[PDB]
Amino acid sequence: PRKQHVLNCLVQNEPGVLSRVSGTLAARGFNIDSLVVCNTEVKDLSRMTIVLQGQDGVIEQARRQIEDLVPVYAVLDYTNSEIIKRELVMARISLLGTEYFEDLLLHHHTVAEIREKQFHPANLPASEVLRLKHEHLNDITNLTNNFGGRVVDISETSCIVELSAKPTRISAFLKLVEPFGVLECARSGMMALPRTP
Amino acid sequence: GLDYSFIGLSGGQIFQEMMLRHDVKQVFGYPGGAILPVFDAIYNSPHFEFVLPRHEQGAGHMAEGYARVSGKPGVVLVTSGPGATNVITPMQDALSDGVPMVVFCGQVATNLIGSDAFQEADVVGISRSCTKWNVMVKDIAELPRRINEAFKIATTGRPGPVLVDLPKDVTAAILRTPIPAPLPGDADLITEAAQMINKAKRPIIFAGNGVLSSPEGPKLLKELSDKGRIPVTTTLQGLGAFDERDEKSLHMIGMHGSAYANFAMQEADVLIALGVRFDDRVTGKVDTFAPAAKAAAAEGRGGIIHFEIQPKNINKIVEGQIPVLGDVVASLGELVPQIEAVDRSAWIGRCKATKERYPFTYTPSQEGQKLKPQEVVQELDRQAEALGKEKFVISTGVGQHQMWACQYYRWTEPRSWVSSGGLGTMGFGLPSAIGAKVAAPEKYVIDIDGDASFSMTAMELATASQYDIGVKVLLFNNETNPDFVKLSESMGAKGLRCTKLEDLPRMMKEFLEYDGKRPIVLECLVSSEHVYPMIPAGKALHEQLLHPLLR
Numbered sequence: 205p206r207k208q209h210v211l212n213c214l215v216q217n218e219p220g221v222l223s224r225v226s227g228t229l230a231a232r233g234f235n236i237d238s239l240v241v242c243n244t245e246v247k248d249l250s251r252m253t254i255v256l257q258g259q260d261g262v263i264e265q266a267r268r269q270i271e272d273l274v275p276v277y278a279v280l281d282y283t284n285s286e287i288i289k290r291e292l293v294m295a296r297i298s299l300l301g302t303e304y305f306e307d308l309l310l311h312h313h314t315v316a317e318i319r320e321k322q323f324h325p326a327n328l329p330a331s332e333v334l335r336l337k338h339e340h341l342n343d344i345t346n347l348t349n350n351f352g353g354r355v356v357d358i359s360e361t362s363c364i365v366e367l368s369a370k371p372t373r374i375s376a377f378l379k380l381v382e383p384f385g386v387l388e389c390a391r392s393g394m395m396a397l398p399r400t401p
Numbered sequence: 402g403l404d405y406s407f408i409g410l411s412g413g414q415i416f417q418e419m420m421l422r423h424d425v426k427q428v429f430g431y432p433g434g435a436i437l438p439v440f441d442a443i444y445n446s447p448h449f450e451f452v453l454p455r456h457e458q459g460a461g462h463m464a465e466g467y468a469r470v471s472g473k474p475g476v477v478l479v480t481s482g483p484g485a486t487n488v489i490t491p492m493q494d495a496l497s498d499g500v501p502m503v504v505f506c507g508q509v510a511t512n513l514i515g516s517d518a519f520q521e522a523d524v525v526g527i528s529r530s531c532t533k534w535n536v537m538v539k540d541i542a543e544l545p546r547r548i549n550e551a552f553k554i555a556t557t558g559r560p561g562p563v564l565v566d567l568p569k570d571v572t573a574a575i576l577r578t579p580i581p582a583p584l585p586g587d588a589d590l591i592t593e594a595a596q597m598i599n600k601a602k603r604p605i606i607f608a609g610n611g612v613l614s615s616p617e618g619p620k621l622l623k624e625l626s627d628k629g630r631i632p633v634t635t636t637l638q639g640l641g642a643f644d645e646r647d648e649k650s651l652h653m654i655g656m657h658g659s660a661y662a663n664f665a666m667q668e669a670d671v672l673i674a675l676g677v678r679f680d681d682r683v684t685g686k687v688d689t690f691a692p693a694a695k696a697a698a699a700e701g702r703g704g705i706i707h708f709e710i711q712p713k714n715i716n717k718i719v720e721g722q723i724p725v726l727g728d729v730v731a732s733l734g735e736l737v738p739q740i741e742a743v744d745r746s747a748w749i750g751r752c753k754a755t756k757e758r759y760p761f762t763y764t765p766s767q768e769g770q771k772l773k774p775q776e777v778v779q780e781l782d783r784q785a786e787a788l789g790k791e792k793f794v795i796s797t798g799v800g801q802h803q804m805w806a807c808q809y810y811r812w813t814e815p816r817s818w819v820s821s822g823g824l825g826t827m828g829f830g831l832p833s834a835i836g837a838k839v840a841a842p843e844k845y846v847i848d849i850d851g852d853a854s855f856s857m858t859a860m861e862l863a864t865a866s867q868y869d870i871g872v873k874v875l876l877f878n879n880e881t882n883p884d885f886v887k888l889s890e891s892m893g894a895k896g897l898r899c900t901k902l903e904d905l906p907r908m909m910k911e912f913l914e915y916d917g918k919r920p921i922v923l924e925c926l927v928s929s930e931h932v933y934p935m936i937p938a939g940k941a942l943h944e945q946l947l948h949p950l951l952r
């Protein structure tokens with residue numbers, strides 16, 4: 205039953221242990237779907253969350269192999285337990301709409317019909333471009349507010365939204381804001397902390 | 402709160418002090434511009450004997466065999482780039498067979514690291530997978546602690562290799578400032594194991610390399626076998642932990658183990674596994690291994706008792722009903738006082754019966770043709786037993802000859818068995834023997850190598866002659882191959898060739914009688930056969946394949 209698994213590791217904060225831990229999973233032919241690693245309040249210790257797909261049998265012996273590593277102090281397979289799944293995503297979204305957005309898509313591989321589309325900025329006065337950029341901004345803001353997010357940065361052409369929720373909500377929000385034109389995004393990958401519920 | 406032991410000392414002076422602090426008396430290595438500040442600080446120091454092999458791979462295998470005889474880490478000192486990458490194979494082998502080993506290798510100056518300079522390689526990254534732990538000393542103030550951690554890691558738990566990457570500018574610097582400064586398993590589980598052992602109807606002891614960790618291991622294994630009247634079998638790396646001339650002793654078990662150990666292990670209702678990872682070449686087919694132990698566990702009357710110090714090797718291949726995490730020699734210390742002697746005549750008789758009904762056998766060279774390989778080993782066993790079995794250390798390559806040495810040579814002495822079993826590196830026999838003869842210069846160090854294995858490291862005979870290291874090479878040849886006599890005498894090994902059973906005792910005696918400070922090769926023209934017993938692919942241990950005259 206190829207299920208998805210989440211490993212939390214307490215690990216030493218020396219160089220190479222990420223390469224050693226990442227490599228230990230690669231030895232077994234494991235693709236790290238997401239990994240998060242940072243310092244603890246203890247400067248010489250780091251906590252990391254590893255997310256991957258595999259059957260529990262192979263994943264358990266992989267987990268027991270990782271924990272054997274010298275810089276590794278503990279690895280917990282939090283998959284079959286009450287954890288709190290969260291993930292932070294940042295996304296820069298264009299306010300110019302799917303008309304103009306194709307120009308950028310075309311020109312980062314490089315147009316006649318697209319620049320003659322009804323709601324392309326070249327065919328519109330400066331205010332309706334201003335009003336539509338703010339209308340698109342208002343839709344993105346209402347959308348990101350509904351998922352529990354925040355509009356962090358705003359510019360003449362785009363805006364940055366910040367959202368932290370379940371990875372399902374994160375994927376849903378990204379797909380839901382896709383038609384505005386995501387210029388670049390950065391999701392943290394799944395992070396987890398066990399719950400007592 | 403500051404340590405001044407190293408103030409004013411260069412990197413090499415800090416190094417030799419750190420080597421003395423770890424009772425390091427013998428080192429192996431090869432020079433190079435990236436490690437010269439450390440190389441010149443040890444070669445010229447008289448505290449350490451230095452041995453310069455012809456290849457850095459030999460140095461690693463020489464440190465392996467040195468570490469097997471003298472249960473202490475073998476120190477390796479190679480240069481950066483090509484030198485260090487040559488030790489990758491001996492390093493993975495030490496990790497695969499649990500051999501304590503410490504590799505100090507040079508590196509370009511820290512400002513040139515990453516610039517792909519001359520002889521720069523990601524040694525810390527290449528060794529990372531094949532080493533137990535590694536580090537790159539980035540400042541001279543780190544050097545003493547990183548060395549302490551290197552030896553500590555290499556020798557604790559399951560022993561293994563560590564690599565310390567030493568930049569040239571770090572070890573050539575001077576430290577002008579000070580710096581800041583065997584446990585058993587759970588008592589109740591040990592007790593549970595003893596009570597299970599005492600109530601066992603037919604138990605078996607399964608000894609591995611973990612028993613050889615301390616000299617008190619075999620002493621306590623003999624006590625467990627005597628006080629419990631329990632038969633003993635060993636892995637290929639447990640050879641020597643139990644005296645095989647004991648009538649209680651089943652011999653090696655596994656793919657090519659003894660038919661009686663393969664049979665008795667499958668009938669035993671209790672397994673006493675002592676420092677053994679259950680290799681695929683031990684179990685045959687995992688689900689079919691020890692069915693009587695499996696069934697005795699389902700009824701609560703027995704099962705597998707597992708003593709391991711590494712938590713990843715417990716329940717990793719075989720469900721152990723009573724896991725005893727911790728040192729096995731310390732766990733045994735609290736174990737054998739709880740073992741009550743019980744009548745096990747029938748069980749011993751059953752084993753002893755099969756031991757006499759399915760022995761290692763083979764049709765000898767009927768006419769005057771080439772030697773059967775088993776005949777060469779049997780003649781070595783007879784003459785070594787007469788000369789004094791305790792005076793012998795025996796290493797092997799990797800091949801048929803390796804199994805013949807396990808089958809037809811009787812193993813009595815702890816830490817007298819130096820073979821590559823985990824990684825199976827061919828060419829291991831000759832340098833490991835050179836390393837063995839170094840750790841025990843007074844002992845008969847025999848190398849049982851084959852024509853293909855010997856060919857991978859045979860140039861190290863020049864190292865044996867240069868340092869008066871009298872390794873006695875027993876070469877098995879079958880045939881495309883060179884003249885191994887003229888080959889050996891090219892570099893000082895006064896070798897000779899045998900070719901008949903009627904010729905064998907004289908040649909075997911003259912080869913053992915040769916100068917113990919002078920290498921010699923006994924080439925044997927041998928008719929290579931198959932290895933029996935054998936476990937076919939996907940067959941159980943009791944579906945063994947004895948065949949010559951036992952079908």
Ligand SMILES: Cc1cc2nc3c(=O)[nH]c(=O)nc-3n(C[C@H](O)[C@H](O)[C@H](O)COP(=O)(O)OP(=O)(O)OC[C@H]3O[C@@H](n4cnc5c(N)ncnc54)[C@H](O)[C@@H]3O)c2cc1C
Pocket residue numbers: 497498499558559560608609610611612614615635636637638639653654655656657658675676677678679680682683708709710711714727728729730799800803821822823824825826
């Ligand atoms: C051609 C070939 C054929 C082979 N066929 C066979 C065969 O038929 N039968 C066979 O047995 N082997 C065979 N081998 C070797 C086999 O592959 C394994 O390497 C061998 O079984 C190792 O067994 P081991 O557990 O005793 O040694 P190791 O692999 O070294 O494991 C020893 C275990 O003891 C533990 N340990 C170490 N020190 C302590 C301590 N102080 N306290 C507690 N635990 C400790 C270690 O953690 C380790 O897990 C063969 C090898 C070759 C090259």
Ligand SMILES: CC(C)[C@H](N)C(=O)O
Pocket residue numbers: 215216217218219220221222223241250
């Ligand atoms: C803890 C880990 C990420 C460490 N910082 C490394 O370099 O691998």
Ligand SMILES: Cc1nccc(N)n1
Pocket residue numbers: 799825826827828
């Ligand atoms: C070293 C070595 N090479 C190839 C095969 C083998 N067994 N061992």
Ligand SMILES: [Mg+2]
Pocket residue numbers: 800851852853877878879929
């Ligand atoms: Mg051969």
